[PDB]
C-alpha cells in the first residue's frame, strides 16, 4: 500500500486509498537533485522534469473545470448513460480492477469528459445568475 498497493485489488479497495497514488506521482523521482553542465544526463533530466509537470497540469486542468479543484473524489451531477456499461451496482465494484475498467470505457471515455464540463460547470456556475443576489 506504499504505492499502487491496490493495483490488482478491487476498485472499491483501491478507492479506499487513492490518496497515496496521487501524492507520489508529481513529487516523485528525486528531480530536485570539468566545469560544464551540458551533459547528456542533464538534458534528459530537464525534459523528464518538464513532462512531470506538464502531465500533472494536463490532468489538474480537467478537475478545475469540474468543481474538483481540491477534492480527490467529486460526485458529479451528470447522469450515467446505459450504453456505456450494462453492469449493476455491485457487479463492477466487487469484481473488476481499475485496469479492466480503464479498457472498458477507453472507447467512449472522451464522450464522458465533454459532457462533464457542461452540466457540472458550464451550467452550474451559470445557475447562480438568479440565485446569487435576489
Amino acid at each position: 500500500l506504499g504505492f499502487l498497493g491496490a493495483a490488482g485489488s478491487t476498485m472499491g479497495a483501491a478507492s479506499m486509498t487513492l490518496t497515496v497514488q496521487a501524492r507520489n506521482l508529481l513529487s516523485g523521482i528525486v528531480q530536485q537533485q570539468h566545469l560544464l553542465k551540458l551533459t547528456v544526463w542533464g538534458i534528459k533530466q530537464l525534459q523528464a522534469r518538464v513532462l512531470a509537470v506538464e502531465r500533472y497540469l494536463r490532468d489538474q486542468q480537467l478537475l478545475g473545470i469540474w468543481g474538483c479543484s481540491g477534492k480527490l473524489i467529486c460526485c458529479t451531477n451528470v447522469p450515467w448513460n446505459s450504453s456505456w456499461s450494462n453492469r449493476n451496482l455491485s457487479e463492477i465494484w466487487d469484481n473488476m480492477t481499475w485496469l479492466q475498467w480503464d479498457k472498458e470505457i477507453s472507447n467512449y471515455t472522451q464522450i464522458i469528459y465533454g459532457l462533464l464540463e457542461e452540466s457540472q460547470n458550464q451550467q452550474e456556475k451559470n445557475e447562480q445568475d438568479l440565485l446569487a443576489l435576489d
Partner: nanobody, 131 residues
Framework: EGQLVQSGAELKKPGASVKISCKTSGYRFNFYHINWIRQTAGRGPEWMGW????????????????RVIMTTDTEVPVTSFTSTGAAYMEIRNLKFDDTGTYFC????????????????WGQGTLLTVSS
C-alpha cells in the same frame, strides 16, 4: 463469463476413495472461490465446502470435514485477466447414500458481503456407488 468444466464419469466400489477434477478457463483463478454440491436420490441437493485458491483458508461442511478434504494447486496465467487452473477433491468414505451427481461452481464475486455462494456451473459429474 468464465467456463468451468468437470472431469466426469468416474465410479468405484462403496468402500473406495476417488477424486474428481475441474478444468477452469476464462477467469482469474486466484480469488474466485471453488465449492461443491451434490444431489442425492433424495429431493434436496446439499452444499459441501468452499476452497480459496489463495491462502487456502477453507471452511468445509461440519458433517464432511472429518472424511472429505479437498486441495487445489496454483494456476498458469494466460493473460493479465484470463487464466486456467484446476481444483480437486478427495473423499474417503461413501455408501449408496453418497451416490448421485456432483457439481463444482465458480465463486460468486471477489468481495465481502457474499462470495462463498456459486456462480458459473460446470457440466457436472455423476457418480454411481452401486456395488
Amino acid at each position: 463469463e468464465g467456463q468451468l468444466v468437470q472431469s466426469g464419469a468416474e465410479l468405484k466400489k462403496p468402500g473406495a476413495s476417488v477424486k474428481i477434477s475441474c478444468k477452469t478457463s476464462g477467469y482469474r483463478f486466484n480469488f474466485y472461490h471453488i465449492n461443491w454440491i451434490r444431489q442425492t436420490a433424495g429431493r434436496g441437493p446439499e452444499w459441501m465446502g468452499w476452497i480459496s485458491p489463495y491462502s487456502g483458508d477453507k471452511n468445509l461442511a461440519p458433517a464432511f470435514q472429518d472424511r472429505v478434504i479437498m486441495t487445489t494447486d496454483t494456476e498458469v496465467p494466460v493473460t493479465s485477466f484470463t487464466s486456467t487452473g484446476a481444483a480437486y477433491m478427495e473423499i474417503r468414505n461413501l455408501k449408496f447414500d453418497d451416490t448421485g451427481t456432483y457439481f463444482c461452481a465458480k465463486g460468486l464475486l471477489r468481495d465481502g458481503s457474499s462470495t462463498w455462494l456459486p456462480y458459473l456451473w460446470g457440466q457436472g459429474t455423476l457418480l454411481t456407488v452401486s456395488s
